[PDB]
Design a protein around this ligand. Structure first.
Ligand SMILES: CCCCCCCC/C=C\CCCCCCCC(=O)OC[C@H](O)CO
Lengths: 104, 117, 114
């Protein structure tokens, strides 16, 4: 269950690949710069959160497709809603870094 | 076509935000509360760590609520095919949102009560 | 206040159902209680105390959403006879990242604290 999903998300969508490399990249940047623990955590928790949400949205997209092939207005709403949840996570993480980084 | 997809899903997301605000009423109310909290945190005299924690905590609520709205949208969709509905998934979704708000409340209280006397 | 009690009730019904049905959620429940007690016990600043709790809270949030997704699939697969756990896999991956995030948070904070 755990690892099975992580791989499929990495093989299929760049939206997870781009954030995936970002997560690794963010951790490196956080550890290199001399900041306090709270700042170190907030920078990686933000980027990892986007990955967390992206995985959940990817689960939503998977269910919608399994049910039917009809272009229904409710199922289409679901994939859009989940897509918005990731957007906020991206926005939140971007806002997070900018606020914290502006010191440096 | 990677550059093209950047605006593709941007359209989906923006359409999702519109869809949430119009249909979901709980998203409307929390958004009011959240947007207020964000502005307050943006004008509060606090450190960057405190400022982020104040904004992120209420932002998560919006993120969770959106996922709950997506989940409910699937249950409501499936409700077309099958007559009976436990509502067990929707209850879990509501639970998740609750914990988010609880977290946001606890985060704010702890951060303020320390920052303040 | 007309409908907000109903919403909260739904949230309670879900929490109680998750506590009984899923024993993994039971483990995460104590983890939050632990995090709260540990953070309040140890002499730490507000920002650190929040991050310790918020991490474990985040896991619990994701687990509830994951359990909600699984509850959807378990309704579908029961009647469709179609059994492809693409959703339960991605859903479980999302929880794992929450776990990892909590561990790193607890590591990074406590390592700089001591
Ligand atoms: C350094 C701090 C800021 C960066 C780190 C935090 C943000 C996540 C990383 C990259 C954003 C670009 C990659 C994602 C591109 C869009 C993905 C997308 O739209 O995915 C479809 C849908 O929105 C969901 O399923």
């Amino acid at each position: 269950y755990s690892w099975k999903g992580l791989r499929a998300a990495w093989i299929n969508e760049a939206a997870f690949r781009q954030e995936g490399v970002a997560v690794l990249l963010a951790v490196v940047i956080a550890c290199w710069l001399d900041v306090d623990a709270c700042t170190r955590v907030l920078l990686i928790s933000s980027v990892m959160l986007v990955m967390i949400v992206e995985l959940l949205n990817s689960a939503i997209e998977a269910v919608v497709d399994r049910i039917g092939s009809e272009y229904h207005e409710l199922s289409g709403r679901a994939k859009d809603l989940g897509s918005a949840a990731v957007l906020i996570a991206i926005i939140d993480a971007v806002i997070t870094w900018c606020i914290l980084l502006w010191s440096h």
